[PDB]
């Protein structure tokens, strides 16, 4: 009665944290390629902002 | 007489190369830098072109 109740208790958490990582996994890697190329656009704009003076 | 005469011509041939060297030193070192900075600027322009559509 202890095992069956606390195993039911546990199957819900395990269902919850699995359901969380499914959503989370896409969003963080997409955010990571997004924040990466922001810094790229920002690094390349710094060398383009002075391209006119340098020419 | 022929030793003194030969010292003088050989002194003119050193004197001429010493003008040639002074411009050679100038334009290779001035050009080396001027190529580096332009090509450096260029990778940032090409970057920025994309990376602003990607932004």
Coordinates of N, CA and C in Angstrom, one line a residue, chain A:
Chain A
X1 N 0.9 -1.2 0.0 CA 0.0 0.0 0.0 C 0.8 1.2 0.0
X2 N 2.0 1.2 0.8 CA 3.1 2.2 0.7 C 3.7 2.2 -0.7
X3 N 4.2 1.2 -1.3 CA 4.8 1.1 -2.6 C 3.9 1.6 -3.7
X4 N 2.6 1.1 -3.8 CA 1.7 1.5 -4.9 C 1.2 2.9 -4.9
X5 N 0.8 3.5 -3.7 CA 0.8 4.9 -3.5 C 2.0 5.7 -3.8
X6 N 3.2 5.3 -3.2 CA 4.3 6.2 -3.5 C 5.0 6.0 -4.9
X7 N 4.8 4.9 -5.5 CA 5.0 4.7 -6.9 C 4.1 5.5 -7.9
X8 N 2.8 5.6 -7.5 CA 1.9 6.6 -8.2 C 2.3 8.0 -8.1
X9 N 2.6 8.4 -6.8 CA 3.3 9.7 -6.5 C 4.5 10.0 -7.4
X10 N 5.4 9.1 -7.4 CA 6.5 9.2 -8.2 C 6.4 9.3 -9.8
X11 N 5.4 8.5 -10.4 CA 5.2 8.4 -11.8 C 4.7 9.8 -12.3
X12 N 3.8 10.4 -11.6 CA 3.5 11.9 -11.9 C 4.7 12.9 -12.0
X13 N 5.7 12.8 -11.1 CA 6.9 13.7 -11.2 C 7.7 13.5 -12.4
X14 N 7.9 12.2 -12.6 CA 8.7 11.7 -13.7 C 8.1 12.1 -14.9
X15 N 6.7 12.0 -15.1 CA 5.9 12.5 -16.2 C 5.9 14.0 -16.4
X16 N 6.0 14.7 -15.2 CA 6.2 16.2 -15.3 C 7.5 16.6 -15.8
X17 N 8.6 16.0 -15.4 CA 10.0 16.5 -15.8 C 10.5 16.1 -17.1
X18 N 10.1 14.9 -17.5 CA 10.0 14.6 -18.9 C 9.3 15.5 -19.9
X19 N 8.0 16.0 -19.5 CA 7.2 16.9 -20.3 C 7.8 18.2 -20.3
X20 N 8.4 18.7 -19.3 CA 9.3 19.9 -19.2 C 10.4 19.9 -20.2
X21 N 11.2 18.8 -20.3 CA 12.5 18.8 -21.1 C 12.2 18.8 -22.6
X22 N 11.1 18.2 -23.0 CA 10.6 18.2 -24.3 C 10.4 19.6 -25.0
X23 N 9.8 20.4 -24.2 CA 9.6 21.8 -24.6 C 10.9 22.6 -24.5
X24 N 11.7 22.4 -23.4 CA 12.9 23.1 -23.1 C 14.0 23.0 -24.1
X25 N 14.2 21.7 -24.5 CA 15.3 21.3 -25.5 C 15.2 22.1 -26.8
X26 N 14.2 22.4 -27.4 CA 14.2 23.1 -28.7 C 14.6 24.6 -28.5
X27 N 14.0 25.2 -27.4 CA 13.9 26.6 -27.2 C 15.3 27.1 -26.8
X28 N 16.1 26.5 -25.9 CA 17.5 26.7 -25.5 C 18.5 26.6 -26.7
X29 N 18.4 25.6 -27.6 CA 19.3 25.5 -28.7 C 19.1 26.5 -29.8
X30 N 17.8 26.7 -30.1 CA 17.4 27.9 -30.9 C 17.7 29.2 -30.4
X31 N 17.5 29.5 -29.0 CA 18.0 30.7 -28.3 C 19.6 30.8 -28.5
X32 N 20.3 29.7 -28.3 CA 21.8 29.6 -28.4 C 22.3 30.0 -29.9
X33 N 21.8 29.5 -31.0 CA 22.1 29.9 -32.3 C 21.7 31.3 -32.6
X34 N 20.5 31.7 -32.1 CA 20.1 33.1 -32.1 C 21.0 34.1 -31.3
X35 N 21.5 33.9 -30.0 CA 22.4 34.7 -29.3 C 23.8 34.8 -29.8
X36 N 24.3 33.7 -30.3 CA 25.5 33.5 -31.1 C 25.6 34.5 -32.3
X37 N 24.6 34.3 -33.2 CA 24.6 35.2 -34.4 C 24.2 36.6 -34.2
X38 N 23.6 37.0 -33.0 CA 23.5 38.4 -32.6 C 24.7 39.1 -32.4
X39 N 25.7 38.4 -31.7 CA 27.1 38.7 -31.4 C 27.9 38.7 -32.7
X40 N 27.7 37.9 -33.7 CA 28.2 38.0 -35.0 C 27.7 39.2 -35.8
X41 N 26.5 39.4 -35.8 CA 25.9 40.6 -36.5 C 26.5 41.9 -35.9
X42 N 26.6 41.9 -34.5 CA 27.2 43.0 -33.8 C 28.8 43.2 -34.0
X43 N 29.6 42.1 -34.0 CA 31.0 42.1 -34.4 C 31.3 42.5 -35.9
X44 N 30.5 42.0 -36.9 CA 30.6 42.4 -38.2 C 30.2 43.8 -38.5
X45 N 29.2 44.4 -37.8 CA 28.7 45.8 -37.9 C 29.7 46.7 -37.4
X46 N 30.4 46.4 -36.3 CA 31.6 47.2 -35.8 C 32.7 47.4 -36.9
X47 N 33.0 46.4 -37.7 CA 33.9 46.5 -38.8 C 33.4 47.1 -40.1
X48 N 32.0 47.2 -40.2 CA 31.3 47.8 -41.3 C 31.0 49.3 -41.0
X49 N 30.9 49.7 -39.7 CA 30.6 51.0 -39.2 C 31.8 51.8 -39.6
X50 N 33.0 51.2 -39.4 CA 34.2 51.9 -39.8 C 34.6 51.7 -41.3
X51 N 34.0 50.7 -42.1 CA 34.4 50.5 -43.5 C 34.5 51.8 -44.4
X52 N 33.6 52.7 -44.3 CA 33.7 54.0 -45.0 C 34.8 54.9 -44.7
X53 N 35.2 55.2 -43.5 CA 36.4 55.9 -43.0 C 37.6 55.1 -43.5
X54 N 37.6 53.8 -43.3 CA 38.8 53.0 -43.7 C 39.0 53.0 -45.2
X55 N 37.9 53.0 -46.0 CA 38.1 53.1 -47.4 C 38.6 54.5 -47.9

